[PDB]
Design a protein around this ligand. Sequence first.
Ligand SMILES: Cc1cc2nc3c(=O)[nH]c(=O)nc-3n(C[C@H](O)[C@H](O)[C@H](O)COP(=O)(O)OP(=O)(O)OC[C@H]3O[C@@H](n4cnc5c(N)ncnc54)[C@H](O)[C@@H]3O)c2cc1C
Ligand SMILES: [Br-]
Ligand SMILES: [Cl-]
Length: 499
Amino acid sequence: NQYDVIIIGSGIAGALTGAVLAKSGLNVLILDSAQHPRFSVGEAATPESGFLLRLLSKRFDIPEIAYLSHPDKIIQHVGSSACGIKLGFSFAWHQENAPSSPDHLVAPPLKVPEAHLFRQDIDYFALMIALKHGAESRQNIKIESISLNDDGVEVALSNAAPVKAAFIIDAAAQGSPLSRQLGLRTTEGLATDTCSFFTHMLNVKSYEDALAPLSRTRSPIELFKSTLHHIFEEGWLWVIPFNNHPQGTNQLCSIGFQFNNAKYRPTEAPEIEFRKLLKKYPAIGEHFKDAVNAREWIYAPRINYRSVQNVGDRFCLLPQATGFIDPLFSRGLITTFESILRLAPKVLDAARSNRWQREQFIEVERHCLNAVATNDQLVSCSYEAFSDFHLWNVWHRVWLSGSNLGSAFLQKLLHDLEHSGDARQFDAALEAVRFPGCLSLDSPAYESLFRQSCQVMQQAREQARPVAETANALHELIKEHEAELLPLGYSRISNRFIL
Ligand SMILES: Cc1cc2nc3c(=O)[nH]c(=O)nc-3n(C[C@H](O)[C@H](O)[C@H](O)COP(=O)(O)OP(=O)(O)OC[C@H]3O[C@@H](n4cnc5c(N)ncnc54)[C@H](O)[C@@H]3O)c2cc1C
Ligand SMILES: [Br-]
Ligand SMILES: [Cl-]
């Protein structure tokens, strides 16, 4: 075998996977059909993704991976166009045939700033980390076939010699050739059925200049410096600026709108569908008066999918190749970076002992399948919560309380790894969690709340219950479970900005 591991796809997942494996002593090859620079979606960084990036950096001793978790460090080391700032999430609610109220807004601010990842520069920077640590990159290739055997993997390429390796990691992310040929992908048993239009734009106005200033909204953060979600019955639109950091030089703002296909199926071209949306919601249109498009619209008719299995003797699909739900709540990078953190140590043990069996990577599958399953419950219920503001306001505390518990648990693992310096203890502690894939990670009290809350929302969809009844039901559940959650005051509805 020419190599130890072959990685398909040279975006952030594949490049970071290649970096840690090259650093750990494996002879790594990274294949890609596209080439850098190239555009990619997956821009909103979360607190969990920040800790998971810092864990990867510490666990495998690569300081440059930790630079991607903080916006100032991106600006300094990657480049000044490589990210915007993020001081939180903002969810502005809208209704067709009604003027938009500035009071219909929830915006839980963050403690430490996060990045809005300009992925063309971030993913190329991630590949450069892999290349500097000894990984080989081959771009612009054409995969003829991928053969899996009991003694190894063999990849055949157009106009080149075939390459061979012990393992193959699919990081190709929804153009996954290994997912196609194995017959793992399916949309069966998915609550979320959604499409997506997305692009990058110039001259997009800020929320403050377009809709309502800080004095009016009373928000502790500028929504300009946040992942802004414009939500409404049939779907949502995102405003993710890269031009919101003071030292930043990027002019672009990522814009993407999604529909629930059960409520609205788009019929016409992306630009026509966009203007029809701004007609429906004039408030959202205030962003795009003098705005112009910086690239083509991409239309994905169904972004949702999952897999029945995602590992074998000689392979392992990374989360994006495995399954995906929706941009909402930015769960893709969280699942991605955690799956690498779980996979990499097991691949090292396989490569070091020459044992390549499915049972060794079973905990990578269990996490990944549960994560997509959880996020499907989270998103499908969240899409149903868009129908009314008060319903959403109550509902988002279910997500937020889970995300805070999950962030604190990953922070605890980082704190123990930094002080103790014990890699095996960290790997075991991460594997020891009671609810792998879920939002809280380890808390049974939260998962009780989460799974009961989702039953209420699915009952509300199936029987078409009133929004006041559903909102009350969730409020009693929060009040029941509040004591076991963090002491933040999740139950008081009048507080729309949970510090
Ligand atoms: C519309 C949309 C919005 C999203 N929004 C968010 C968000 O707000 N927050 C968030 O955290 N996540 C989001 N995600 C998920 C996000 O895309 C992933 O978390 C992340 O981008 C995955 O990185 P990656 O390197 O695996 O994939 P990518 O960055 O897409 O890289 C994959 C690479 O594989 C290559 N490739 C494809 N097919 C083949 C083949 N047959 N052979 C060889 N190479 C191939 C591609 O050319 C590409 O270079 C979103 C996804 C979509 C579709
Ligand atoms: Br997801
Ligand atoms: Cl996501």
